[model samples]
Target: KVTMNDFDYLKLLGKGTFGKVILVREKATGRYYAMKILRKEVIIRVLQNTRHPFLTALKYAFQTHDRLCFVMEYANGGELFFHLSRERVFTEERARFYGAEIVSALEYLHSRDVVYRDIKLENLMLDKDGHIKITDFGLCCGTPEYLAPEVLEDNDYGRAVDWWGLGVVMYEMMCGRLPFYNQDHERLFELILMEEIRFPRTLSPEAKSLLAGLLKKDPKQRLGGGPSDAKEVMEHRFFLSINWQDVVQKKLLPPFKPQVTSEVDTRYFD
Candidate 1:
């Protein structure tokens, strides 16, 4: 029953495939929030019931004549993409930490029968605590570089697509570039489907093995695509250093933390 009139609209956060986001302050509580404007049955259904420590929280939702609005917890730490753009690349340990958190998030979503079809740097937001909070659960429309082979082929896809997205993200995090890319999206798809991965010397063998398992062109063989699901990814040797219980409780210290001066801080965002 919430409405736009209940909040004071602040600055525009940014735009997305689904809609634009604006920073807003709730009049009654004075709490800052990120208002996502979209126009979806899936989004409302998923967001209303889905709750996870590593997923963004939907505080309130309402509808106007033509738009569906979601007032989500304002993660003042900004996008993981925002930080990566400035840092160029993350250390192996840092990448692994973030990767584990993302895996935890995707695991929870898949268990709920919701496949987070979009999993990319921009969609991974960091709270002031520096942990990952995945956002945007709409379907199909995703950045080409992260699209899994099955998705690009127009084949029936499911949760496995998210693992492939993680593969692309991991490559970018470790190597500072996309694994397969081109100006021509046609060629990019070709590369995604046909090209073999070439790793940089910086990545360890365990990391390469994990990425290979995730990026398998055949979705059936991809890591996390099995009946075991995300447990398969969680058990990978690359994350042997992680303790699942600790991760779920957010006990592990983040490799990097954004400097947040206030609850409404936008310094981390551009």
Candidate 2:
């Protein structure tokens, strides 16, 4: 039941074809929120009902005459993409920490029959505490480099698609580049379907193995695609350093925290 007049829009955080995100401060409470403005929308039911440590929480839902707005948890650490861009590549320890958190997130989503459908570094936000807080569960778009083969082939897919994204994201975090790329969509799809991933010589064997399992072209054979789902993915050798209990509880500290001089600092956004 909030309104546009209720808060001051501080900064433009992100944009897409249909809408943009605004960093806002509630006038009454002084709480921060990332306000998503859309021309039209749904998937509100899922967002309204679900709650998880690694998933962004919906704080308020309201609408104006011409637009719909959602006030969501503002993960002030900014996007994982922001940090990855600056660092080039993450150490295995940092990547593992982030990866384990995402595993816990996807597990919770799949259990609720809510397929995230999108899992990219840009969508993974690091809260001020440095833990992962995955955002954006809407439909209607896909990043070619992160799309699963099943999706590219126009076949029916499910939660398995998200696992493939995790594979691609993990590769990108460690290798500092996408696993597949092309200027054209057709060629990109071909590479995703037929081309084998080429890993950097520096990637550890355990990580390489885990990436292969996640990048399997066959959804039926992909890691986390089976009955055990996230449990299977969590048990992989690559995550030997992770403690599932601590990850779900968000007890482990993040390997890196975004620098912030104030609660309203927008340096992390741009």
Candidate 3:
């Protein structure tokens, strides 16, 4: 079982329904890390048998105990939500940069047969260099809202859901809001089930078209139709100017920096 003596817990970083996250320092290397402690009962109840690419990747750092503790690579910068929500909006060019990075990350995950069901501003983290690091795979599942209509109705979903989520993230970043918004989850699901998405007037045609195609309710039409179709989404016009090679290598400069000037700022964690 993992114990507190394995690492030094610095401070409370984040908290959720089942557990909490803390900034920890490895005893040997003194390297900072983010550790997520998940209660065993909660894991069994909510996430049993549900596996995801991102979650699997994180397994290498997991330490099991009465509670499962995942010691993750600590991102010193912060979350993408802090900048987007506080700023209220982003420049098109800035949006494209972040969007492209996320696409690259999704591409990597989809290749391994993983569908990241939860894609929203709040789930993205920024590293010190300002690159995006995705987090929080707890609620991820074969949900219909993110999956193609057929997949949702039939409980059959795959990597294509990542593409749909990509479209949603893109829209949220550019428009400063979700394309489909309702206070109730059922109503939101209904809208996703039946209503067609309408792009904001301010969005560029390329972006709108790209999202529409990616967000298609039909799995067959969704981007990344298995392995052969993966490259197609990466090559969309919305990412026309982006140098795919450079983006994956983290060679391109980020458009915005997280407001984390010191270790005292906890605003980034929420």
Q: What is the TM-score of each candidate against the true structure?
A: 0.90, 0.90, 0.79
| lDDT string, candidate 1, 1-270, tens digits | 689899998877767656778888899888788888885643557767899889888899888877888898877786787788788899888999999999998888898998887788777878888988887633123455557889878765699999998988888888887775434565886788788888888689999998889889888899988999998999999999999889989999989888887666757644
lDDT of each: 0.82, 0.83, 0.67
Model 1, TM vs. native: 0.90
Q: Which stretches of model 2 miss by more than 4 angstroms?
A: 41-44, 137-144, 181-186, 261-267
lDDT of 3 by residue, 1-270 (tens): 445687877787667678877777777666667788878787662232333322312422454657777776656566676678777777777888877777777776666555667665666767766777777733222322444565557766677776777777777777887776534456665667787988878888888878788778877777665456657876878777889889878889878776666444544545
Candidate 3: TM-score? 0.79
Preferred candidate (lDDT higher): 1 or 3: 1
Q: After superposition, how far is residue 209 of candidate 1 from its true place, in Å?
A: 0.8
What clash pairs does model 2 have? Answer: none
Evaluated against the true structure, the overall lDDT of model 1 is 0.82
10 residues in a row with least lDDT, candidate 1:
137-146
| Candidate 1 wrongly placed segments (more than 4 Å) | 16-18, 40-44, 137-144, 181-186
